[PDB]
Short mmCIF file of C-alpha atoms and ligand atoms in Angstrom, two decimals:
data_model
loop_
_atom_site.label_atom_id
_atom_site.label_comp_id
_atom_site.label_asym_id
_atom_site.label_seq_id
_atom_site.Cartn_x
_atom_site.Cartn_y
_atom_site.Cartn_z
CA UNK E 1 0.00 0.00 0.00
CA UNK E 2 1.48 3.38 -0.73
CA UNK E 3 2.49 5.78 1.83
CA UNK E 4 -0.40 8.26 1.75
CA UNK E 5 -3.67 8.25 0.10
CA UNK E 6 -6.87 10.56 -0.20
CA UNK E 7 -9.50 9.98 -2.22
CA UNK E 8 -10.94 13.88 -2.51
CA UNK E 9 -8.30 14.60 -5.37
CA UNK E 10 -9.29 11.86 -7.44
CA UNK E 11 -12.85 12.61 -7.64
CA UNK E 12 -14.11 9.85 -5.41
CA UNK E 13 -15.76 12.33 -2.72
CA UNK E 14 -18.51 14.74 -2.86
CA UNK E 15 -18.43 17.80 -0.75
CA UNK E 16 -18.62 17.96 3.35
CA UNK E 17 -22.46 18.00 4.21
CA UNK E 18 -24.78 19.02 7.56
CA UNK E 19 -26.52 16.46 9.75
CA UNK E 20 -28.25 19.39 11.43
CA UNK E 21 -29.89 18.67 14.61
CA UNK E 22 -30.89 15.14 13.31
CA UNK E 23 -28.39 12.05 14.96
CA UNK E 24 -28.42 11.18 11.08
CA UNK E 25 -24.57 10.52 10.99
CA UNK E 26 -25.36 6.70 10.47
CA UNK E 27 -27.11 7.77 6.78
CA UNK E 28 -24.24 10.20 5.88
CA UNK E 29 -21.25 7.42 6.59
CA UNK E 30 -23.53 5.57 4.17
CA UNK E 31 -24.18 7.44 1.54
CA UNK E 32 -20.55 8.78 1.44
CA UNK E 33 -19.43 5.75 1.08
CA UNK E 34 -21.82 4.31 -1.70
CA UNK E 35 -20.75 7.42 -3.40
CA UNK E 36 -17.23 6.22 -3.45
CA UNK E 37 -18.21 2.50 -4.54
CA UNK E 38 -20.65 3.76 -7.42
CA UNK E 39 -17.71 6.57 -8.27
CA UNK E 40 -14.84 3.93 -8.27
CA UNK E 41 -17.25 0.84 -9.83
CA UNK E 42 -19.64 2.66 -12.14
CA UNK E 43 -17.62 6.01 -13.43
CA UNK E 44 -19.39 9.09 -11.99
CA UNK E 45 -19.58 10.77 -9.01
CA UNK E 46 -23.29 11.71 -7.40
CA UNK E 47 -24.42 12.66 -4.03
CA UNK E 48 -26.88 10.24 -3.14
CA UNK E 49 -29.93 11.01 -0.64
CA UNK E 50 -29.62 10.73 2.96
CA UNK E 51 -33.43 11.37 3.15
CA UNK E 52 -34.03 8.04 1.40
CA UNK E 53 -32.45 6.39 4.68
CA UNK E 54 -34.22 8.42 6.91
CA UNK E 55 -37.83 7.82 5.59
CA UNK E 56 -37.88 4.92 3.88
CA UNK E 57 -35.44 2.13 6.31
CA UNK E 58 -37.69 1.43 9.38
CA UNK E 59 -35.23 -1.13 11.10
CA UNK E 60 -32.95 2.12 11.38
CA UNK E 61 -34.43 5.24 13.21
CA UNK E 62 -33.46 7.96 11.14
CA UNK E 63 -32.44 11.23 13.93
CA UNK E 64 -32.29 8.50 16.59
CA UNK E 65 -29.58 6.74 15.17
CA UNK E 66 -28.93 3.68 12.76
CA UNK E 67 -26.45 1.32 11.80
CA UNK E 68 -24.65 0.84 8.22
CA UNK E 69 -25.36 -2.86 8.31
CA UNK E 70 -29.03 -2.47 8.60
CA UNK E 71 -28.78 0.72 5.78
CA UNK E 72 -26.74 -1.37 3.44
CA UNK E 73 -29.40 -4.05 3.40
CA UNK E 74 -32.33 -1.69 3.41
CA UNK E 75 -31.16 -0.23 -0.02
CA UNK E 76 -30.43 -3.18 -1.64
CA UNK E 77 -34.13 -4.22 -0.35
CA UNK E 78 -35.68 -1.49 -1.75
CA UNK E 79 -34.13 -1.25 -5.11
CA UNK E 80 -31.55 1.31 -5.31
CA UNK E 81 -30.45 4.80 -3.67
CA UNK E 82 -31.99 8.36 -5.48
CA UNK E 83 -29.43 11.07 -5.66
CA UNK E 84 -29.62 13.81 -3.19
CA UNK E 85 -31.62 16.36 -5.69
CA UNK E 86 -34.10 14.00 -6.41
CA UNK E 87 -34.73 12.82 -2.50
CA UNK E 88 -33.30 16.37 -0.53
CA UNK E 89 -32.77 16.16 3.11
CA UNK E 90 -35.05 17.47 5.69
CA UNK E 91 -33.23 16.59 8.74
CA UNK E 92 -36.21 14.68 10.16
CA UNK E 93 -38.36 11.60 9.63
CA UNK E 94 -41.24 11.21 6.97
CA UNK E 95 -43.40 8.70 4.77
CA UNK E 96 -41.44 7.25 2.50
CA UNK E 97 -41.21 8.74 -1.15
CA UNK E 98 -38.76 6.59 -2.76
CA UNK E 99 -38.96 5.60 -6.21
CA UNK E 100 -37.62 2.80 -8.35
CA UNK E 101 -38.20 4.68 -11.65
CA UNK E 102 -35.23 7.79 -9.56
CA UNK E 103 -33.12 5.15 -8.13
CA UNK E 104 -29.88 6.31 -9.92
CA UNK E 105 -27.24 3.64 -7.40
CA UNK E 106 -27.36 -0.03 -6.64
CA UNK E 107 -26.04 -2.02 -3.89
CA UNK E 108 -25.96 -5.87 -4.58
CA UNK E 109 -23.96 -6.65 -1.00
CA UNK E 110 -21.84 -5.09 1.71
CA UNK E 111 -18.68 -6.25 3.15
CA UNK E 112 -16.71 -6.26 7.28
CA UNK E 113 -13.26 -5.26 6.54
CA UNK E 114 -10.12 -5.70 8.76
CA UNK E 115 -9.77 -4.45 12.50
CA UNK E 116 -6.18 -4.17 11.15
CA UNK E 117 -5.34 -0.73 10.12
CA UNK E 118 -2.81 -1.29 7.69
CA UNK E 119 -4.81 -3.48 5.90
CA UNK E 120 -7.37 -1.10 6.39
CA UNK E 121 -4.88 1.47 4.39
CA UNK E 122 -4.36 -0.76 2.19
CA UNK E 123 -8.21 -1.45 1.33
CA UNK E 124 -9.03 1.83 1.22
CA UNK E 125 -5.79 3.07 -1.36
CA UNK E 126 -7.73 0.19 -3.66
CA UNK E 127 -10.76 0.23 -3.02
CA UNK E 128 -12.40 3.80 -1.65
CA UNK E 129 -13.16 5.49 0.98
CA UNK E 130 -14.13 3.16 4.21
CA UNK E 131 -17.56 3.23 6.33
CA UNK E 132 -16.58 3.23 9.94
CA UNK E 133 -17.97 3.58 13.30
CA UNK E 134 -15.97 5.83 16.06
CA UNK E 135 -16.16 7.15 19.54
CA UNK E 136 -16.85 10.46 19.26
CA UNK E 137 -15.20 11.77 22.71
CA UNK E 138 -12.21 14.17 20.68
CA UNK E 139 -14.52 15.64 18.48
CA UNK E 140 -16.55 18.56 20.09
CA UNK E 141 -14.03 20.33 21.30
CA UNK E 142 -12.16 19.14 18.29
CA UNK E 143 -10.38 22.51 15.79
CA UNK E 144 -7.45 21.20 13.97
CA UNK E 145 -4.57 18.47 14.20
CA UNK E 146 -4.38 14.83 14.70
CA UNK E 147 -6.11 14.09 17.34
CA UNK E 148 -5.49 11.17 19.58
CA UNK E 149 -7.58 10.99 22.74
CA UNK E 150 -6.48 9.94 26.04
CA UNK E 151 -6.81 6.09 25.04
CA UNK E 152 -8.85 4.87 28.05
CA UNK E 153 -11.42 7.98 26.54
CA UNK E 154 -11.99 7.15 23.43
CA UNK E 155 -12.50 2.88 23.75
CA UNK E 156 -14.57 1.29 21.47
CA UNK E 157 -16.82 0.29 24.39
CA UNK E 158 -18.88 3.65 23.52
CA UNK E 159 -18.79 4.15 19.56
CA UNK E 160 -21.38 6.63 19.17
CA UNK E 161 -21.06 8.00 15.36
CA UNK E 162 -20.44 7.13 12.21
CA UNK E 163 -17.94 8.47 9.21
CA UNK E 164 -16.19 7.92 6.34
CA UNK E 165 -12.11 7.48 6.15
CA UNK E 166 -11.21 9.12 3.38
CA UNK E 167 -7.31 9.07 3.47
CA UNK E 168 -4.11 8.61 5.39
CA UNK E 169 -0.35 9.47 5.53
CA UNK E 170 1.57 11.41 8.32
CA UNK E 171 2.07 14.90 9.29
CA UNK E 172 5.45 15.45 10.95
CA UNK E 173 5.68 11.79 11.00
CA UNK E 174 2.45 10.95 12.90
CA UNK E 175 0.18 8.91 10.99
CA UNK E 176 -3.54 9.59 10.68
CA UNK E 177 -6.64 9.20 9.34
CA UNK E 178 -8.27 12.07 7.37
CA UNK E 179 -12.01 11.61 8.49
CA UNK E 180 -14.85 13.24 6.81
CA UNK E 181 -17.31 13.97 9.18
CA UNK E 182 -21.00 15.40 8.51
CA UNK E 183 -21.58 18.41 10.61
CA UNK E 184 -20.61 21.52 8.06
CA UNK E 185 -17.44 22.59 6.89
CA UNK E 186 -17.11 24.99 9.78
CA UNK E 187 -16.47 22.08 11.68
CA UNK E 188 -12.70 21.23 12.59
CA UNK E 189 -10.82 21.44 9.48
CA UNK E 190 -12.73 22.29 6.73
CA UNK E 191 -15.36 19.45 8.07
CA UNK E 192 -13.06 17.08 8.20
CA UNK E 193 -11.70 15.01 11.62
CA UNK E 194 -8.04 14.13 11.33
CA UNK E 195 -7.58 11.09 13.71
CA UNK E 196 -4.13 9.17 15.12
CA UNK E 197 -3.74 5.98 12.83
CA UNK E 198 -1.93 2.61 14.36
CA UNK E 199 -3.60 3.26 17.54
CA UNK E 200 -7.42 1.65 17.35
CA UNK E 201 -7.86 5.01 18.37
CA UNK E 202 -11.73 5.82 19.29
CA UNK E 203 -12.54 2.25 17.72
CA UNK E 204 -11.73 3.70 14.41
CA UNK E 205 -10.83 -0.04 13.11
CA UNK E 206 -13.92 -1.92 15.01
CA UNK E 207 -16.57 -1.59 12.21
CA UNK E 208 -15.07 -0.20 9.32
CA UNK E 209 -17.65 -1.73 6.52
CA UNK E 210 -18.21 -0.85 2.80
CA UNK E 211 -21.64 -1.07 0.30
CA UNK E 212 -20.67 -3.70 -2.63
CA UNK E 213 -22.73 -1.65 -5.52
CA UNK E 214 -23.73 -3.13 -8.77
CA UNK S 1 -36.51 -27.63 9.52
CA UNK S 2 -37.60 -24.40 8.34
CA UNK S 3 -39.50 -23.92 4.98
CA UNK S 4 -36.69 -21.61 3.49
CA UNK S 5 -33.63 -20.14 4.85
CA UNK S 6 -30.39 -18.00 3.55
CA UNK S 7 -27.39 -17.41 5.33
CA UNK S 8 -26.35 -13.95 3.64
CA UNK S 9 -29.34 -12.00 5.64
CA UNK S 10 -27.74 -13.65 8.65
CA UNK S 11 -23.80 -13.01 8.13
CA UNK S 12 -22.24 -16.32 7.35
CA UNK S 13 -21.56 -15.62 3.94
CA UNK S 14 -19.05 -13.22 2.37
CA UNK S 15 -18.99 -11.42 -1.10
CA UNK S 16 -19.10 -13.41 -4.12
CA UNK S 17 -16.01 -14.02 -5.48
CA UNK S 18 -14.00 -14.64 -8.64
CA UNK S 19 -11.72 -17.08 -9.38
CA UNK S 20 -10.54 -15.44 -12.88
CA UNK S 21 -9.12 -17.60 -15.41
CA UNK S 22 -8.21 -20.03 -13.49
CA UNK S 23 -9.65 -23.59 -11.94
CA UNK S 24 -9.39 -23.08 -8.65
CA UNK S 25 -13.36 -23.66 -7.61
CA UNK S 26 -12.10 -26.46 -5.32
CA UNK S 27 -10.74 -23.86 -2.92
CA UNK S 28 -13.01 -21.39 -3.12
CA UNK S 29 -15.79 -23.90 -2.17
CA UNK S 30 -13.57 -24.70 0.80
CA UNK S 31 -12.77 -21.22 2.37
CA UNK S 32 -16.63 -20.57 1.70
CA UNK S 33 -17.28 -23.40 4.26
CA UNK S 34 -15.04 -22.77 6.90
CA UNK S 35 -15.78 -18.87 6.37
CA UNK S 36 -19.58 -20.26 7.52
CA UNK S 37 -18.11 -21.96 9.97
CA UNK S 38 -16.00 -19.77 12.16
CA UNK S 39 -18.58 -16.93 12.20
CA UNK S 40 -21.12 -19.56 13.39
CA UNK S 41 -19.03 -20.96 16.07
CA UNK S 42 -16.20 -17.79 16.63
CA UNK S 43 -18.72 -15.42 15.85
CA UNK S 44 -16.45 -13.23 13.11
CA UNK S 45 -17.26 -13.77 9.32
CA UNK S 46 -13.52 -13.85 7.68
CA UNK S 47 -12.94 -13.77 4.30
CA UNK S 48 -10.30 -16.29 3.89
CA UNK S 49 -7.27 -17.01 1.64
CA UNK S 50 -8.13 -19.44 -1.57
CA UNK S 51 -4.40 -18.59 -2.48
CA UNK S 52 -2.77 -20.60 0.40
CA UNK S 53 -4.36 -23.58 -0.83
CA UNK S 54 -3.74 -23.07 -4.18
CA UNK S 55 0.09 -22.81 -3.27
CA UNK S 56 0.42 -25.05 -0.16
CA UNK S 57 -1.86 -27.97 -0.66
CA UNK S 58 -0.10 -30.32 -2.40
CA UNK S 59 -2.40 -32.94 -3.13
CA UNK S 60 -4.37 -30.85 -4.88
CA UNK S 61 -3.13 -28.83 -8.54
CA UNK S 62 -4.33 -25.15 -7.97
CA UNK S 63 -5.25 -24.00 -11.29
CA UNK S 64 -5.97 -27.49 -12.54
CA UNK S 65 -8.01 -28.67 -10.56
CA UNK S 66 -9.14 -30.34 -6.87
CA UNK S 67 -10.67 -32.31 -3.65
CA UNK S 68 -12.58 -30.48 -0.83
CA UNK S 69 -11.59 -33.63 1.17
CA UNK S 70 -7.80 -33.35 0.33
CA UNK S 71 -7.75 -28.93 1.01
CA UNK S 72 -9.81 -29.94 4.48
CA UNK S 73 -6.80 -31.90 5.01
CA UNK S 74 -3.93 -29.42 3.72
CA UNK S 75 -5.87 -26.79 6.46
CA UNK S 76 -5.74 -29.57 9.05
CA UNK S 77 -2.23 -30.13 8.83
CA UNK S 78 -1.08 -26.71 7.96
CA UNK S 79 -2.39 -25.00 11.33
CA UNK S 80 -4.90 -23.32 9.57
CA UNK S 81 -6.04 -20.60 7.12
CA UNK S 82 -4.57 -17.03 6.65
CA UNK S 83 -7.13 -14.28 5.62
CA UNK S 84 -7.76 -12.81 1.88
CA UNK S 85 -6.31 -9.65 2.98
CA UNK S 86 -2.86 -11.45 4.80
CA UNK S 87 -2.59 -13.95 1.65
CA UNK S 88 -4.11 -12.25 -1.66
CA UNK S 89 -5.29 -13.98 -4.67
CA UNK S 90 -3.40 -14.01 -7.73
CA UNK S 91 -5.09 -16.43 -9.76
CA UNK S 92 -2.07 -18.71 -10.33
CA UNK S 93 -0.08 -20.43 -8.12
CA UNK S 94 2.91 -19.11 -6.14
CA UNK S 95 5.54 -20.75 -3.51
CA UNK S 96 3.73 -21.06 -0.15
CA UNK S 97 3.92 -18.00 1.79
CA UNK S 98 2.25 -19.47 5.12
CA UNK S 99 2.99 -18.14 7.96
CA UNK S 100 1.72 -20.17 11.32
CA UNK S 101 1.33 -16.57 13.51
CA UNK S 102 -0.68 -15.28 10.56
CA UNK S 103 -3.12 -17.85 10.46
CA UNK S 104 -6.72 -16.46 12.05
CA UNK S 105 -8.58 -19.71 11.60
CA UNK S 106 -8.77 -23.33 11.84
CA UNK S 107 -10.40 -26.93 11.33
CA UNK S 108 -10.43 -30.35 13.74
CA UNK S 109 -11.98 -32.06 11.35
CA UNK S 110 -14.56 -32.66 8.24
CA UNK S 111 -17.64 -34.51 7.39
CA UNK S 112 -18.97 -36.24 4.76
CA UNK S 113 -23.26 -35.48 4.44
CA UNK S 114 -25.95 -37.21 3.64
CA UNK S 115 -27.13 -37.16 -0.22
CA UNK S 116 -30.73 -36.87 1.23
CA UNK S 117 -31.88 -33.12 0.43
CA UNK S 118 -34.16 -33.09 3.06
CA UNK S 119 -31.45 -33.76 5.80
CA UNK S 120 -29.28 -31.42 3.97
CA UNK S 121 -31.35 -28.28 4.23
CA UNK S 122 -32.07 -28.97 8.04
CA UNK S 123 -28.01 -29.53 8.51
CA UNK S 124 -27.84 -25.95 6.30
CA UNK S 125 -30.66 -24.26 8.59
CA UNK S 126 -28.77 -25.56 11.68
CA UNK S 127 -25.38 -25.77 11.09
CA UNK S 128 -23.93 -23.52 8.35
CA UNK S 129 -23.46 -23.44 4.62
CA UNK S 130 -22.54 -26.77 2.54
CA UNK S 131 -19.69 -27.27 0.34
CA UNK S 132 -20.62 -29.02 -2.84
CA UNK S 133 -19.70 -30.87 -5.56
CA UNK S 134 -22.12 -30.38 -8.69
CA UNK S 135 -21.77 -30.83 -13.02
CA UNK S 136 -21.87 -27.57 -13.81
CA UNK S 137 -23.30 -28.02 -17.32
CA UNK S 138 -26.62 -25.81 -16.44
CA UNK S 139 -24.33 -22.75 -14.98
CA UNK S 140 -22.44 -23.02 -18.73
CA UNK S 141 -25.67 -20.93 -19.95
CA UNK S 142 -27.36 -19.46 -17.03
CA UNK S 143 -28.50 -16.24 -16.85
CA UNK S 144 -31.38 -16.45 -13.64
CA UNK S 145 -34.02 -18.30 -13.01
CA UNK S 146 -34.32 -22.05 -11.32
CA UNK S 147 -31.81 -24.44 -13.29
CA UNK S 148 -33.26 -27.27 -13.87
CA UNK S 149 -31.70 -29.15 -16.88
CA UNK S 150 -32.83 -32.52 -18.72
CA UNK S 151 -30.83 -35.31 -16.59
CA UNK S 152 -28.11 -36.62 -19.78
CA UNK S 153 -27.44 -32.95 -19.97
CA UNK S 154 -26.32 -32.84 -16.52
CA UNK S 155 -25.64 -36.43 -15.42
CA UNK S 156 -24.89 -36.05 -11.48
CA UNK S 157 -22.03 -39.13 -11.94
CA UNK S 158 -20.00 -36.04 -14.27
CA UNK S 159 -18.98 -33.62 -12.05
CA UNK S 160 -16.32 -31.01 -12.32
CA UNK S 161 -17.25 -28.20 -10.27
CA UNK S 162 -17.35 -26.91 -6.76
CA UNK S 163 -19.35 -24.63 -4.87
CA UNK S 164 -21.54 -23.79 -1.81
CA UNK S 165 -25.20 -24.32 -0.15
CA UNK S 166 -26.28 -21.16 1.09
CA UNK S 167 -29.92 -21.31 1.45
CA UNK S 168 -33.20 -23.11 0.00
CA UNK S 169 -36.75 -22.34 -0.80
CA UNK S 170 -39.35 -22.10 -3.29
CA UNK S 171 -40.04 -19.50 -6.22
CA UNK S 172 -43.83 -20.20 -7.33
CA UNK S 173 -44.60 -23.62 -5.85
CA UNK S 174 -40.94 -24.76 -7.32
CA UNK S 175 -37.88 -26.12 -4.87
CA UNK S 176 -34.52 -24.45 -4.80
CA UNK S 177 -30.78 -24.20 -3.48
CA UNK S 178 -29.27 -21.02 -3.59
CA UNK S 179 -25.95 -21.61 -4.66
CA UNK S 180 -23.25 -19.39 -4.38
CA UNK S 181 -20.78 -19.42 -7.28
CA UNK S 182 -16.92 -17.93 -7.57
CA UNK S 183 -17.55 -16.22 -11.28
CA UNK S 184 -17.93 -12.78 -10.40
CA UNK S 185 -21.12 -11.09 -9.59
CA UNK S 186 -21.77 -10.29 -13.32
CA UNK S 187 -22.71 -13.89 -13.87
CA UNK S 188 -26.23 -15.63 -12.58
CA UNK S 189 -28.17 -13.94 -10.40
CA UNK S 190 -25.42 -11.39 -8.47
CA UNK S 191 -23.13 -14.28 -8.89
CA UNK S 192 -25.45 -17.01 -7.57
CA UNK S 193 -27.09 -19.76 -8.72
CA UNK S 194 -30.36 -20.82 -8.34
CA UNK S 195 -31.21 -25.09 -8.90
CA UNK S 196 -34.28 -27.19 -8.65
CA UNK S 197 -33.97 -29.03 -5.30
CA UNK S 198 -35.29 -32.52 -4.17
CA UNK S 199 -34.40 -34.16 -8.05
CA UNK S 200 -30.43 -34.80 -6.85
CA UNK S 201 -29.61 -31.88 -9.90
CA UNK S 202 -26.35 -31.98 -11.22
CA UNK S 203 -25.56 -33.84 -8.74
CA UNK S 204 -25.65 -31.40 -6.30
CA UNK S 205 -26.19 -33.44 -3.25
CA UNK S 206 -23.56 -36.37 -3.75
CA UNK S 207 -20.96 -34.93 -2.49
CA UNK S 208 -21.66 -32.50 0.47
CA UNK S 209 -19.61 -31.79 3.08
CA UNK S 210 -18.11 -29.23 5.73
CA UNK S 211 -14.85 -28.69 7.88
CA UNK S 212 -15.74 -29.16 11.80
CA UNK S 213 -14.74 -26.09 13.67
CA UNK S 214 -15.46 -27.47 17.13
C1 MYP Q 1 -28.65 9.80 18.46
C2 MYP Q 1 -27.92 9.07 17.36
C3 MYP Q 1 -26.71 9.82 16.80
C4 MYP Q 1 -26.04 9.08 15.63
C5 MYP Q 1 -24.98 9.95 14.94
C6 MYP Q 1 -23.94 10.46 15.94
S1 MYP Q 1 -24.13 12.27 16.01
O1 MYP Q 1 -25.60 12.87 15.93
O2 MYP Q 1 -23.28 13.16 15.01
C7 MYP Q 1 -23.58 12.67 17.63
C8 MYP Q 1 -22.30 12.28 18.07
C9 MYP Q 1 -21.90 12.54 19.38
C10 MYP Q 1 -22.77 13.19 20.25
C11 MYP Q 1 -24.04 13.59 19.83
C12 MYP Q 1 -24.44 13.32 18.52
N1 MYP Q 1 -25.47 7.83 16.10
C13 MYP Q 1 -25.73 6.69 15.46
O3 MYP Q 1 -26.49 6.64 14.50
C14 MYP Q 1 -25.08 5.43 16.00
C15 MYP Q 1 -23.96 5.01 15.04
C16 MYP Q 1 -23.29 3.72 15.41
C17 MYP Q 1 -23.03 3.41 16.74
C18 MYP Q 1 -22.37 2.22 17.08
C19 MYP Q 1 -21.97 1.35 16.07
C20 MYP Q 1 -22.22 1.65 14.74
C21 MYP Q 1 -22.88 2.84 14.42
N2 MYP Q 1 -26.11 4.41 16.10
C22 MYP Q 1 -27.17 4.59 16.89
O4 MYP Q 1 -27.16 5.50 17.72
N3 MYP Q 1 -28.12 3.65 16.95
C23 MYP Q 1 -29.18 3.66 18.02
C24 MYP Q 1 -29.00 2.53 19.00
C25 MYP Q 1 -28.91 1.15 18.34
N4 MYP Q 1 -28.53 0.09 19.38
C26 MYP Q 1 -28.66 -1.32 18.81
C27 MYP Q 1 -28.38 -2.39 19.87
O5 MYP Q 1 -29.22 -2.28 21.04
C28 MYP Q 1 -29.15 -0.94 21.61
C29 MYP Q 1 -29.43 0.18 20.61
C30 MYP Q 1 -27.84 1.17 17.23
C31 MYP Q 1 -28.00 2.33 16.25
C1 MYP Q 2 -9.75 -27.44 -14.29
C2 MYP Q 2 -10.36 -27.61 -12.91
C3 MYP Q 2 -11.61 -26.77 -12.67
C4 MYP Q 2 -12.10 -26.84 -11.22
C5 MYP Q 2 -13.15 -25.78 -10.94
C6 MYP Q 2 -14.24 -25.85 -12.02
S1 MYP Q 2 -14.39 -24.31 -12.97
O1 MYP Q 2 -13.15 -23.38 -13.26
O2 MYP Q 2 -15.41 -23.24 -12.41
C7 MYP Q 2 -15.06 -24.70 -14.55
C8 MYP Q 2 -16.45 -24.87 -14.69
C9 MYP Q 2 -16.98 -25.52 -15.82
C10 MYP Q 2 -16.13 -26.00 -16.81
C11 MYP Q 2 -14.76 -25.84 -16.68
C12 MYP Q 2 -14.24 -25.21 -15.57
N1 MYP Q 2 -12.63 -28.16 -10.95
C13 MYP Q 2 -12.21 -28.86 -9.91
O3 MYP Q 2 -11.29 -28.50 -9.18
C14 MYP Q 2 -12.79 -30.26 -9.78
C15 MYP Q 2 -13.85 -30.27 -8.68
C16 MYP Q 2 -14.34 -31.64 -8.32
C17 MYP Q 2 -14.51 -32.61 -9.31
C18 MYP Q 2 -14.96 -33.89 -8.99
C19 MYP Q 2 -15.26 -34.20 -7.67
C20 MYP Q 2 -15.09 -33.24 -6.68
C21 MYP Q 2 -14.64 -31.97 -7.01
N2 MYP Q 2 -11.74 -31.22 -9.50
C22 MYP Q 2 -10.98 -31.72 -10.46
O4 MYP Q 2 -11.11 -31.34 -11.63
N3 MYP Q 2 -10.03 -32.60 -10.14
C23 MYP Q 2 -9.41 -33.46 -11.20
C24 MYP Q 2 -10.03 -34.84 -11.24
C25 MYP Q 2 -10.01 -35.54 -9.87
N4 MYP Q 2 -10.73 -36.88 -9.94
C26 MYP Q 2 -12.24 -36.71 -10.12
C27 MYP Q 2 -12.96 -38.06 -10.11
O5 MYP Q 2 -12.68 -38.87 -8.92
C28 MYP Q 2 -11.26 -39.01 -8.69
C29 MYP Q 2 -10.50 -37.70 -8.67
C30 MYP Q 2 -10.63 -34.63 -8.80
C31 MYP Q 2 -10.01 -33.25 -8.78
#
């Protein structure tokens, strides 16, 4: 695997987005990473709805949190993912309005990926940017840098949000994990969460997961 | 035993895979097993390495062909089986690069089932996906559907293929195994295959059988 990666650059991640005051995170670490799959395995580059997730996957629920194993399944159950435009977000719950005829994405299957993190660099250099579950204890107070939380802090005991890993390499030889989160791009730097790597830190390599699209 | 049931809702199954140009079904029918079988009874679904049997089982001929009984055995004595991400697939075979601390799962033993298809979907239900032996002359042409070809076409005493039992049920009043394949997800149905069940097909039930983990 090569010594840094980041997917942004090579057109395999849309823009930071805003959860608002709905504990959506679950549907963004989703969609951001079907994006990457349907980028890397079908050629173009969409945002996909977040709404769809919200409204229309019952087993999840929606502001009250969800899990990408249950989302995965729930798209490929319902035939497909509508792009963002054609499904917009309302930060909230409501009937379902998905359409078959819209459905622009496909997932066929979903994979568990390695608790190692260099394998986990290695994936994601190959394959795209990574779904993955984290403890979110250095992130609200969270501006710039790697962070790496007092270990004992940040256990994967209490994972408690969900992201995307979108790259890796080292700044002044510290290794990290570029993390896109989903609360604005006024959030840490430039919305994105830059995380120790080699560490489990915050559980980062517990339930990293990816969509298997069509 | 139930009226249907399919172990990739439930997380014994990994993605479908693809051996390439090369004739190494054997193995692939072989990790899918004992990938059923440690997340069953270890409670992590691995996706395991076909390539350390194609390069360190010897009674076997990688590319050219081989014997779930004589890979069950190569695992046995080896100490085990190294994942897809520690040992990667190149489609040809290699010097054995086994490594004994690398190795994340192993066998005690395998078994031989019974060629009655009513005992084998209660030992599927209960214990795990089936490795298989079966002619694959109805898989030469399939495109979806249940397989059901005229009996001299697929003679269940001619068989040169091997794959794995994932689930059963019926599709309009008509008996199935869902059979998951190693060509890719472009071919059958996502990459599986669906056959007539309780008519001994292709001779898909003469030669079941799974590793013992436990
Ligand atoms: C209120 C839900 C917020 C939301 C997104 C985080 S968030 O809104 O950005 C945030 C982070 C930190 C502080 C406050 C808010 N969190 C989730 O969706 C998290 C994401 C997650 C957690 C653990 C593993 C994988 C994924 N999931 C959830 O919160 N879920 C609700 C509980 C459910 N449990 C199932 C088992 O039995 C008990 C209940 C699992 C899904
Ligand atoms: C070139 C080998 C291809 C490979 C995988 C099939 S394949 O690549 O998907 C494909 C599908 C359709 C047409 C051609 C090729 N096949 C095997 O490994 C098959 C699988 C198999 C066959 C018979 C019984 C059990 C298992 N094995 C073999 O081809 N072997 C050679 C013959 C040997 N004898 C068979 C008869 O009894 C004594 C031993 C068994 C192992």
């Amino acid at each position: 695997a090569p010594p840094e990666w980041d997917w942004r650059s090579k057109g395999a991640v849309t823009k930071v987005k805003d959860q608002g005051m709905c504990g959506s995170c679950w549907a963004f670490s989703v969609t951001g990473n079907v994006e990457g799959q349907w980028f890397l395995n079908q050629g173009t580059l969409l945002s996909l709805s977040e709404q769809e997730l919200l409204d229309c996957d019952k087993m999840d629920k929606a502001c009250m949190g969800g899990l990408p194993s249950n989302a995965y399944s729930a798209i490929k159950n319902l035939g497909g993912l509508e792009t963002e435009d054609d499904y917009s977000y309302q930060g909230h719950m409501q009937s379902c309005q998905f359409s078959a005829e819209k459905a622009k994405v496909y997932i066929q299957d979903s994979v568990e990926l390695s608790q190692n993190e260099q394998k986990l660099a290695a994936w994601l250099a190959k394959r795209g940017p990574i779904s993955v579950a984290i403890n979110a204890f250095g992130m609200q107070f969270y501006r710039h840098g790697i962070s790496r939380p007092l270990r004992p802090l940040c256990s994967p005991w209490l994972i408690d949000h969900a992201v995307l890993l979108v790259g890796y390499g080292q700044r002044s030889d510290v290794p990290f994990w570029a993390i896109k989160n989903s609360w604005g791009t006024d959030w840490g730097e430039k919305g994105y969460y830059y995380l120790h790597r080699g560490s489990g830190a915050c559980g980062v390599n517990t339930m990293a997961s990816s969509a298997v699209v069509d």
